[PDB]
């Protein structure tokens, strides 16, 4: 698989954070699905960036977060805005890579304690 590395704790005062998930894999010319989940359970997808790296595919949130982001060879930086103190939990960077095969994902990250304050 490919291993993900995230900073172990962020502490936010802006209500506004940026959180790059450094991978061991060049997402260059690759079709994939990059994702970020809240929860110890890991059962709320905060953001999904999904498509061919070749063209620059948009980040978005069904779960209901204000969420941009920027893709790069082997980092993936999520940008969350308008976060709430009550939304402090762990977040997990997670990647599936579709094409070209063979298809693979992430060995599960330690996550990050995003700690929203004030």
């Amino acid at each position, epitope marked *: 698989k490919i291993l993900v590395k995230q900073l172990p704790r962020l502490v936010v005062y802006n209500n506004e954070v940026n959180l790059s998930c450094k991978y061991t894999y060049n997402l260059f010319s690759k079709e994939f699905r990059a994702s970020l989940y809240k929860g110890v359970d890991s059962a709320v997808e905060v953001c999904v960036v999904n*498509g061919n790296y070749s*063209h620059q*595919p948009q980040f978005y949130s069904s779960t209901g977060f204000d969420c941009d982001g920027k*893709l790069g*060879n082997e980092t993936v930086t999520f940008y969350l805005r308008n976060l709430f103190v009550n939304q402090t939990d762990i977040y997990f960077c997670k990647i599936e890579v579709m094409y070209p095969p063979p298809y693979i994902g992430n060995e599960k990250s330690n996550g990050t304690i995003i700690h929203v304050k004030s």
Partner: antibody
Amino acid sequence: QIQLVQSGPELKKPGETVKISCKASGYTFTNYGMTWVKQAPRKGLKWMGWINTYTGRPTYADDFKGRFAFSLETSASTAYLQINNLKHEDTATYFCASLGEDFWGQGTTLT
Amino acid sequence: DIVMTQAAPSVPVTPGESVSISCRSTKSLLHSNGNTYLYWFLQRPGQSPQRLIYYMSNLASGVPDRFSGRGSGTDFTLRISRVEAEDAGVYYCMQSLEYPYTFGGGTKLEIKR
């Protein structure tokens, strides 16, 4: 073949609404964003903004924010630019563009 | 607050003559990402414009090796290695780092009988 295709030419006089279509074909529509770009006649290119095809949310460039309306019918793969209380300045060709700015529309010439 | 400047509004070359086109920038367009956030475009006249290079050095599909984009981090250049008549047009650089995105001025590249 991925391909954007826009509404036809417009002759619209001052103080009118206008919507311009841009219909996207050949790719998973909501997976990529969608920027709009003015081109005054003898002048060059100006970035207006973009809409998130998934989320809906538009961001507008400085000069444009206000009198301009981006918006989407996602099930029918198409993006809309609307321009209100129109003013002679606003005579340009207008390009919808997506897929990382790799695919551009045929353009859409307003007066 | 970010302002691209092509300082060469028009540039006459003849064919075979390699030419290189500059576009400078207020801020640095380099990122933690490693990527540097600049497009280059060619609007042949009449036609809708056409992505040429993306992320500075990287050149899009259906584009000749002739083209190459080289770049400091606020100054960038677009070498065209041997000028075919088809390659004539206006060339636009455009940064995509922060909003609002900002196009350059154009540089018309005229071909000289």
